[PDB]
């Protein structure tokens, strides 16, 4: 039925790159774009193994409760099927942390007892195998509501990181 082509590998690489870009976009005005790039119709999205239903509320809680980081991508998967619209990748992502002691919105941690930002204070990174099962119609740029499964699970988090999960 199926085969082994470079289309699924290029799709996995481009999806990992676009996912890293959309997760490093720290502003709140693009939090609708994450749900619109994922399956806004129906999906299964568990990020850090959380019982989440819709991606919109999760992206809103992300832009209100998470800052930016870096994502070192080191491995991808490419599994495809016929008559089911299957395309499965697994980004081996080393995801960093943000030592701003707040969310993305550039807060002031000091309780005011009486500008330009600081240096990009980062912390230790955690390894994860973020699995994305999406639909393989994107060989000619069709990626509108295709990601049926978004499973973020981790492997190892260093003790030097600021935020503790």
């Amino acid at each position: 039925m199926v085969m082994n082509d470079a289309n699924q590998a290029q799709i996995t690489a481009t999806f990992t790159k676009k996912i890293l870009a959309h997760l490093d976009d720290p502003d709140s005005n693009k939090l609708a774009q994450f749900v619109q790039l994922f399956n806004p119709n129906n999906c299964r999205i568990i990020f850090n193994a959380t019982p989440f239903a819709q991606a919109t509320v999760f992206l809103q809680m992300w832009q209100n409760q998470v800052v930016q980081t870096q994502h070192a991508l080191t491995g991808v998967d490419y599994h495809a099927i016929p008559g089911s619209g299957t395309l499965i990748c697994n980004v081996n992502c080393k995801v960093r942390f943000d030592e701003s002691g707040r969310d993305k919105m550039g807060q002031d941690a000091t309780v005011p007892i009486q500008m330009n930002k600081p240096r990009p204070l980062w912390g230790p990174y955690f390894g994860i195998s973020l699995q994305l099962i999406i639909d393989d119609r994107i060989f000619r740029n069709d990626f509108n509501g295709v990601i049926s499964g978004f499973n973020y699970n981790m492997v190892y988090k260093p003790e030097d990181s600021l935020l503790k999960i």
């Binding site: 039925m1 470079a6 998967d77 099927i81 990174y125 955690f126 190892y156 990181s161």
Partner: protein
């Protein structure tokens, strides 16, 4: 907590006739005690204008939370300058009646000396009500979760069954997968921070790299096309490509962490489990063998009346360390 103040006015220690190297080795003694747990310290007026004898205390007592060091006799900040990212979780410090605490920098540099401070000398220098949700996580994590409890039960059952079968003999990959059920396999070269506990330094999986269908690893198309998975024959090729490893999930069921969900597009259900895979034996097909290495299966099985049939068959080599399940 332990108090180490006024030891030069205690007859149990004054007549013993002995201080700097004594306290710098008493840090080692208190670290090798390991059963007399003390979090904070009380060593006010320790007869030092500098902080030499209390320098290794930040490394030896890394669970510091508070310190009262008043009536000090310090007139500098360079002795305390080494305390950046060292006892930085402590939340209380005051060494007043001194030229180190009555200066100007006591409100602008003390927060740098202890960023995680929820208090500052019987006050609050930061929003301590919101710091527990801003400087840390907002909620906890789930070491095992799914869309439903019975869904997690059946997912863990099929995951442990597949792991036990791949441990015993994976020769029936052709009988486990259908004509459409394909696979994928890759390896994780780069690693995390070096201070990660029991962390593999490098992926010592040098007998599985040629059949790794990873996108950003190799730059070619035909190479990933040959290393990628067809049906049952190439599925068994990927099954006997790597080193056979008995599942280290029954030892640490906690560190064997599995999430799960469904698949609405095919009335299926998915499970992403991750555990260790220690390989005593290897692949018989022709630095060489494995090391401490983990594995993670992201399967998508569609059930029936008889059994479940897989749709995705993933293999991930990684760098083994501790898991995100424990507290």
């Amino acid at each position: 907590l332990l108090n180490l103040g006024a030891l030069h006015s205690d007859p149990e220690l004054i007549q013993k006739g002995v201080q700097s190297k004594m306290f710098p080795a008493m840090m080692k003694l208190a670290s090798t005690e390991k059963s007399l747990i003390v979090e904070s310290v009380n060593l006010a007026d320790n007869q030092l204008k500098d902080i030499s004898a209390i320098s290794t205390l930040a490394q030896t007592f890394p669970n510091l939370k508070n310190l009262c060091l008043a009536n000090n006799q310090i007139f500098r900040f360079r002795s305390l300058e080494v305390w950046k990212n060292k006892f930085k979780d402590l939340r209380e410090l005051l060494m007043t009646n001194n030229p180190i605490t009555t200066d100007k920098l006591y409100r602008t540099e003390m927060l740098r000396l202890f960023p995680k401070l929820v208090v500052l000398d019987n006050v609050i220098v930061r929003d301590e009500q919101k710091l527990q949700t801003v400087y840390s996580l907002p909620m906890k994590i789930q070491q095992f979760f799914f869309e439903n409890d019975a869904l997690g039960q059946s997912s863990t059952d099929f995951a442990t069954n597949f792991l036990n079968l791949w441990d015993n003999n994976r020769e029936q990959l052709l009988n486990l997968y259908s004509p459409q059920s394909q696979f994928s396999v890759s390896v994780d070269s780069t690693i995390p921070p070096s201070t990660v506990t029991d962390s593999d330094q490098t992926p010592a999986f040098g007998y599985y790299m040629s059949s790794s269908r990873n996108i950003s690893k190799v730059s070619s198309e035909k190479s990933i096309q040959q290393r990628l998975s067809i049906g049952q024959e190439s599925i068994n090729s990927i099954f006997k490509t790597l080193p056979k490893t008995k599942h280290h999930l029954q030892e640490q069921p906690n560190e064997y962490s599995m999430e799960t969900i469904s698949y609405p597009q095919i009335n299926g259900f998915v499970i992403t489990l991750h555990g260790f895979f220690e390989e005593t034996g290897k692949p018989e097909l022709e630095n060489n063998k494995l090391s401490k290495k983990s594995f993670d299966r992201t399967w998508v099985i569609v059930p029936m009346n008889n059994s479940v049939i897989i749709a995705s068959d993933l293999l991930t080599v990684r760098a083994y360390s501790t898991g995100a399940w424990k507290t």
